[PDB]
Structures are given as C-alpha cells and as structure tokens.
Write a protein that binds this ligand. Sequence first.
Ligand SMILES: Cc1cc2nc3c(=O)[nH]c(=O)nc-3n(C[C@H](O)[C@H](O)[C@H](O)COP(=O)(O)OP(=O)(O)OC[C@H]3O[C@@H](n4cnc5c(N)ncnc54)[C@H](O)[C@@H]3O)c2cc1C
Ligand SMILES: NC(=O)c1ccc[n+]([C@@H]2O[C@H](COP(=O)([O-])OP(=O)(O)OC[C@H]3O[C@@H](n4cnc5c(N)ncnc54)[C@H](O)[C@@H]3O)[C@@H](O)[C@H]2O)c1
Length: 271
Amino acid sequence: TPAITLENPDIKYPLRLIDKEVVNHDTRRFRFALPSPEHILGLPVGQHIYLSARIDGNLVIRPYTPVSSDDDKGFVDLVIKVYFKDTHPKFPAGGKMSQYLESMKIGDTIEFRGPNGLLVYQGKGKFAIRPDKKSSPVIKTVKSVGMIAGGTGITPMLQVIRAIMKDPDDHTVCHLLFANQTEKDILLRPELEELRNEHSARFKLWYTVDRAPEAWDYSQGFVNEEMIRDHLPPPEEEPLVLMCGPPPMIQYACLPNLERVGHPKERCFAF
Ligand SMILES: Cc1cc2nc3c(=O)[nH]c(=O)nc-3n(C[C@H](O)[C@H](O)[C@H](O)COP(=O)(O)OP(=O)(O)OC[C@H]3O[C@@H](n4cnc5c(N)ncnc54)[C@H](O)[C@@H]3O)c2cc1C
Ligand SMILES: NC(=O)c1ccc[n+]([C@@H]2O[C@H](COP(=O)([O-])OP(=O)(O)OC[C@H]3O[C@@H](n4cnc5c(N)ncnc54)[C@H](O)[C@@H]3O)[C@@H](O)[C@H]2O)c1
C-alpha cells in the first residue's frame, strides 16, 4: 500500500498547515500536508486523531475527526469549530485549542497522533465496534444506519457517509438527522445536499435547527421523538443508530427518544 503516516498511536507526527477554508462564521476546514504527497494518514473509517500543543503554559490535547480518508494521498482535512473569546457569557475565555488553530499561519505545524476510537467501518454495511477500550470488536453488519449529529458531531458521520457512497457495491442506506443552532450553522450544507442529489437511494437527509428561519421545510427545536421516528429507519429494520454531538444532546434528546421509538441499546453507538 502507500506509505502510512500514523504508524503507532503513541508517536507524535508534526504536520504542516497548508490550507484553510471558511465553512461558516465559526467553523473552518483545516488541511494539513502528510509527510509526502504519496503518504496516506492511516485511518480506519470512523476513527479520530488527537492534536496536541503547549498553549499558554499548559498541555492541551484534543481529538478531531478527519473528514478525509486513506484514498486522499498527501493530506488530511479536519473540520473544526472555533470557540471565540469574548462571545459567550458563560465562556468568556473561548476555547483553548480551537483558537490556537485559528491563529495558525500557513506553514505552521502541530503534532498529530492516532488513530483512535471504538468504531471502525469495514465497508459493505460491516461495522467493527468494541464495547470498550479493553475488549474485542463485535462485528455488526446492517442494511441501514441511522445517524444523529449535532454541530461538529457531523464529522464522524461524514467519514462514514463518504466511505459508503464511494463504493457502488455498498448498498448501505444512511439516514442522517443533523441538528444545529440556526440555518447558518448547518455545517457543510452544500456537500450534504450534493450527496443527497447524487445518492438519494442510499442517503436520506433531514435537518433540525434550534431557531428556524421564515421559510423552513425541515424541523425546528432539539432532537425529539417525532424526528427520530420519521427520519431514522424503524426499529423493525434493525438499523445501527450512531450519535455524535454535545453530551446533553446525547443524554437528553437522543437516548430517551430512541427508547420511546423502540431502538434497543445494543443497536446504538455514541462516538
Ligand atoms: C472523539 C472526539 C472527536 C472530536 N472531533 C471534533 C471535530 O472533528 N471537530 C470539532 O470542531 N470538534 C471535535 N471534538 C471537540 C474537540 O475535541 C474540542 O473539544 C473542541 O475543539 C473544543 O476544544 P477547545 O480547546 O477549543 O475548548 P476548551 O478550552 O477545552 O473548552 C471550551 C468549552 O467551552 C465552551 N465554549 C468556549 N467558548 C465558547 C463559545 N465562544 N461559544 C460557545 N461555547 C464555547 C465549549 O463547550 C467549549 O468546548 C471532538 C471531541 C471528541 C471527544
Ligand atoms: N465524540 C466524538 O467523536 C465527537 C466528534 C465531533 C464532535 N463532538 C462533540 O460534538 C459537540 C459539538 O458542539 P457544537 O458547538 O458544534 O454544538 P452546538 O452547541 O452548536 O449545538 C448543536 C446542536 O446540538 C444540540 N444541543 C446542544 N445543546 C443541547 C442540549 N443542552 N440539549 C439537547 N440538545 C442540545 C442542538 O440540537 C444543537 O443545535 C461537542 O460537544 C463536541 O465535543 C464529538
């Protein structure tokens, strides 16, 4: 195969920032060069990496979930929300690592390590999911996958969605319910709607926003029972249900409603 970058998850690999694209008012795509144009990252689908730096005198380590893949030679793409200082009353300092990343210039480097995570998508509906960090993966193959994402929680979902759509012999149907604070907060909307336009048989797309615009054809509010019932595959079809977002989204909006609708805990996984 191509040369792999992440050869051991405990080793740090400094990668250079080569491009940055505005995703919306607070979110960006950060592209980093791999060690050569022929390297691949070494990233089983569904896993994340960790960035680390000394910021204002403290060690700061944070995970980010690449949206690129091992088909992408020579680079890795992260999609990262910046939490700005002097904005939210409860968090006047903003976020440490995200603001550090926002301040990086092209050519600056930061240390990557990985890959990590309990889920690996192995293609053609096959997921290898470890119950925890010390157990063997359980291999679950499904015809359909429900996905509930909030904000930057879209990133592992997009890894999985992209992997599926690339394989014309992968017949897995993804049902995404994507929640954000407002319409302008819907990350990577053109990418998602391009996926829907081109793969409608394998990709079902629905949004909810905390605060809805005048003309709105999707849902409004936190994730609820109705949304899960109408925009994820029914429990009878035994889909896997993947979730990723703010901890209270998982705890209060997803889990109780998945239970109400009838999706068993065994079929549910939170990134
Ligand atoms: C497995 C995993 C994968 C992840 N992958 C991604 C990813 O692909 N992309 C991504 O963007 N994030 C991802 N996250 C989150 C990421 O790891 C960091 O937690 C995030 O970037 C914030 O870290 P920070 O150092 O900037 O903020 P911190 O300094 O650690 O904490 C600040 C916290 O206060 C709040 N806060 C601070 N300022 C504001 C503000 N202005 N407005 C609203 N809230 C604020 C936020 O909750 C914020 O997390 C992932 C998390 C996990 C556990
Ligand atoms: N574990 C992982 O693999 C992984 C990957 C990416 C992101 N994340 C997490 O996803 C979150 C993304 O944060 P963000 O700033 O983009 O989200 P956000 O604050 O903008 O909120 C996005 C959506 O989350 C839901 N939500 C927020 N607070 C809620 C609450 N109290 N109750 C019910 N629902 C609520 C809402 O639907 C909201 O629109 C972070 O916590 C991040 O750590 C985790």
